[PDB]
Design a protein around this ligand. Structure first.
Ligand code: A1B9H
Ligand code: A1B9H
Ligand code: A1B9H
Ligand code: A1B9H
Ligand code: A1B9H
Ligand code: A1B9H
Ligand code: A1B9H
Ligand code: A1B9H
Ligand code: A1B9H
Ligand code: A1B9H
Ligand code: A1B9H
Ligand code: A1B9H
Lengths: 69, 69, 69, 69, 69, 69, 69, 69, 69, 69, 69, 69
């Protein structure tokens, strides 16, 4: 991601890059009711506006896994 | 992703790139009712506006897995 | 991510980069009711506006895992 | 991430970079009711506006894990 | 992250970098009610506007872990 | 993170860097009620505007761990 | 609009009424361009989510009238 | 709008009424461009989430009127 | 708007009323550009989340009127 | 707006009333640009979260009027 | 607005009333640019979170009027 | 606005009233730029969190008026 310019008037040079970006989010909630009952497991809920960038690794978002033996 | 320009008037050079981007989201909820009952498992719910970029890895979003033996 | 310019008028050179960024978020909640009952497990909820960048590692967001033996 | 310029008029050279950044967040809550009952487990809730950058390590945000034997 | 300039008019050279930064956050709460009952476990809640940068280590934010044997 | 300049008019050279910074936070609370009852465990709550940078070590923010045997 | 109940089990009596109410509206706009040129007249535009109740009077919403002589 | 109850079990009596109410509105705008040129007239624009109740009077919302002679 | 109750178990009596109320509004704007040029007239713009109740009078919201002679 | 109760168990009597009330509003703005040029007129803009109750009078919100002769 | 109660158990009697009230408002602004040029007129802008109650009088909020002769 | 109670257990009698009240406001601003140029007129800007109650009089908030002859 480089940007070079030479001159020998308006000159514009740009190089933009986005990875894993969340923006411009508007949320309205009213009288939302939730009830979770877990017995020896895994429950994931209520995930909003989450951004993640992972390099040379495993990336999990809102991941629920049962018991491992 | 490069951008070069030479001059010897308006000159514009650009190079944009997006990967895993969420934007411009509007959500309205009213009187939403939920009920989760889990016994030794995995439950995933309520995932909204999630962006992820993964390199050299396994990326999981809202992934639920049972017990592993 | 470099930016070079030479001159021998307005000259602009830029190089922007974003990874794992959340912005421009507006949230309104009213009378939200929640109830969590966990017995020997894992529960994750209420995750909002979370950004993470991980290099040479495993990145987990809102990840719930059962008991490991 | 470098920035070089030579001159021999307005000249601008820039090189910006963001990783794991949260900004521009407005949150309003009214009469929110919560109730958590945990017996030998792990519960995570109420995570908002969290940014993290990890190098050569495992980064977890709002991660709940059951008992490990 | 370097910045060099040579001259032989306005000349600007900059090199900015951000990692794990939270800013521009406004939060309003009214009559929020919470109740936590824990018996031999781990509960995490009420995390807001948290930034962390970790090098050569494992970084955990709002992480709850059960008993380890 | 260096910054060099040579001259032989306004010349500006800068090199800024931020890691783990929280700023521009405004919080208003009214009649918030909390109640925590813990019996041999760990409870973490009410964490706001926390920044940490760790080098060659494990950094935990708002981390609750059960009893270790 | 009355509600009466007598008792000598769950008993519910209600009487709800709505007049001129707008709710549950989500709007997303992107790159909208407008241009208005008025010379001695009246122009009305961009009216959204407007509610009005008028008693013993004339109610006008987004009403444009030319010059009156 | 009255509510009466007599007792000699759960008993509920209610009487709700709404007039001119706007709620549950989420709006997202991006790069909206506007341009207004008025010469001796009236221009109205950008009206959103407006509620009004008028008794014994004339109620106007986003009303533009030309010159009156 | 009255509420009476007599007793000789849970008894609830209520009487609620709303007039001209705006609530639960979330707005996100990004790079909005505006330009107004007025010469001897009236321009109204950028009206959001406005509530008004008027008794025995004329109520105007975002009303633009030309010159009156 | 009265509330009476007699007793000879939980008894609740209430009488609530709202007129011209704005609440639960979250607004986020980024890089908004405005430009107003007025020559002998009236310009109104940038009105947000305004509530007014008027009795025996004329109530105007964000009202622009030209010159009166 | 009265409240009476007689007794001869929990008894609750209340009578609440609101007129012209603004609350629960969170606003975030970033890099907003404005420019006003007025020549013998009236300009009003930047009005936020304003409440007014007027009895036996004319109440104006963010009202701009041209020259009166 | 009266409150009476007689007794011959918890008894509660209340009578609350609000007029022109602003509360629970959180505002964050960053790099806001303004520029006002006025020549024989009136400019009003930057009004926030203003409450006023007027009896037997005309109440104006953020009102700009041109020259009066
Ligand atoms: C998340 C994100 C991604 C990409 C972004 O990039 C948008 C952008 O660069 N917009 C632009 C350019 C100009 C302009 C004005 C005058 C000129 F002479 C030349 C250019 N004005 O706005 C931004 C964000 C915030
Ligand atoms: C996420 C994302 C992706 C791509 C984006 O790119 C849009 C863009 O660049 N739009 C533009 C260009 C001009 C312009 C017009 C005439 C000129 F002379 C100079 C500039 N105005 O707006 C943005 C985002 C935010
Ligand atoms: C998160 C993020 C990503 C990208 C961003 O980049 C946007 C940007 O650079 N916008 C711009 C350029 C000009 C301009 C116009 C004419 C000139 F002559 C000189 C400069 N005005 O605004 C910002 C953010 C905050
Ligand atoms: C988090 C974050 C990311 C990126 C950011 O970058 C935005 C930026 O640099 N905006 C800009 C440029 C100019 C300008 C004016 C006159 C000139 F001649 C040349 C440039 N004005 O605003 C900021 C933040 C806060
Ligand atoms: C967190 C963060 C990240 C990046 C930031 O960078 C923004 C910035 O540099 N903005 C700018 C440039 C000028 C300017 C215009 C014309 C000139 F001739 C000289 C300077 N004015 O504002 C800031 C923060 C606070
Ligand atoms: C704008 C508007 C109009 C009408 C509305 O009225 C809906 C409503 O009253 N829903 C309801 C009743 C019950 C219930 C639960 C248990 C019981 F024993 C008896 C009743 N639960 O939700 C609301 C709005 C917000
Ligand atoms: C997600 C995404 C993908 C692609 C996008 O690209 C759209 C775009 O670039 N639109 C444009 C160009 C111009 C223009 C004006 C004057 C000129 F002289 C030359 C060009 N105006 O708007 C944006 C997004 C946000
Ligand atoms: C604007 C507006 C209009 C009408 C509204 O009325 C809704 C309402 O009253 N809902 C309700 C009733 C019960 C309940 C259930 C069982 C019981 F035993 C006792 C009470 N739970 O929620 C609200 C608004 C905010
Ligand atoms: C703007 C506005 C309008 C109307 C509103 O009215 C809603 C309301 O009253 N909800 C309710 C009732 C009960 C309940 C619980 C236990 C019981 F035994 C009996 C009743 N819980 O919530 C509120 C607002 C904020
Ligand atoms: C603006 C506004 C309007 C109306 C409002 O009224 C809401 C309300 O009264 N809610 C409620 C009742 C109970 C309750 C439940 C069981 C009991 F036994 C006793 C009381 N809990 O919450 C509030 C506002 C802030
Ligand atoms: C602006 C505004 C308007 C109205 C408001 O009124 C709300 C209210 O009164 N809420 C309530 C009642 C009880 C309760 C608890 C135990 C009991 F036995 C009986 C009642 N707890 O909270 C407040 C504001 C701040
Ligand atoms: C601005 C404003 C308006 C109205 C307000 O009124 C709220 C209120 O009165 N709340 C309440 C009642 C009880 C309670 C519960 C059980 C008991 F036995 C005795 C008292 N706890 O909180 C406040 C403000 C600050």
């Amino acid at each position: 991601v480089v940007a070079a310019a030479e001159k020998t008037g308006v000159l514009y040079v740009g190089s933009k890059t986005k990875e894993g970006v969340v923006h411009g989010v508007a949320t309205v909630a009213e009288k939302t009711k939730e009830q979770v009952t877990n017995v020896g497991g895994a429950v994931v809920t209520g995930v909003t506006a989450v951004a993640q960038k992972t390099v040379e690794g495993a990336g999990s978002i809102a991941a629920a896994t049962g018991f491992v033996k």
